[PDB]
Amino acid sequence: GNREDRKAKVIEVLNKARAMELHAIHQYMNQHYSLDDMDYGELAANMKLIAIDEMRHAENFAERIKELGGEPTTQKEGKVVTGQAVPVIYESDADQEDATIEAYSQFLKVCKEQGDIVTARLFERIIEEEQAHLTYYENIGSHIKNLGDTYLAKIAGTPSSTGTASKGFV
């Protein structure tokens, strides 16, 4: 394809990935609100920190799309599942991070095929972070399934802070 076709194909998968990140942000923050509500502080905090990673992803995809002359999507991909119990949160999140790694690997190939090394490197870096999220999710789901209440007793009442408050406008 010519210069314009190669950017358009790339912009396509970038918006595809962006949509997945927009879903993850809403999905992982939804669970954080429950975890926090359940007073599982350490779980609540790390869930929020992973959501903020996905925020950075959505932000990085957007910027790349702009460099390519495209418009970054505002629609999330899929529906958000609410009211999940602690066990189901980690099983579903693990499944999602695995699916996302899978999808992103396929987008990375499209980038290579359109001869776009900068976008490909973006996907490589963000895939490595996705892997770290997947490991985390798998570990927690394991301790929950294999140890139940004894494990959660240690999480009960733990601190949920994610640090100093977000530098905002006001």
Under rule CB under 8 A, which residues in 78-97 are in contact with a copy of itself? 80, 82-83
Position with the least CB separation from ligand FEC: 166
Residue 84 or 152: the one with the smaller Cβ distance to ligand FEC is 84
Angle at 6 between CA 75 and CA 4, to 5 degrees: 90
| Cβ-Cβ contacts under 8 Å for 94 (sequence gap 6 or more) | 134, 137, 138, 141
Under rule CB under 8 A, which residues in 106-135 are in contact with a copy of itself? 106, 108-109, 115-118, 121, 123-124, 127-129, 131-133, 135
Residue 15 CA to residue 97 CA, distance in Å, equals 17
Residue 8 or 127: the one with the smaller Cβ distance to a copy of itself is 127
Residue from 99, 121, 91 nearest 108 by CA: 121
Burial class (CB within 10 angstroms; exposed 0-12, middle 13-18, buried 19+) of 42: middle
By CB under 8 A, is residue 74 in contact with a copy of itself? yes
Q: How far is the CB of 26 from a copy of itself (least distance, A)?
A: 5
Q: Tell whether 21 is in a known binding site.
A: yes
The annotated binding site for Fe cation is made up of 21, 54, 57, 97, 130, 133
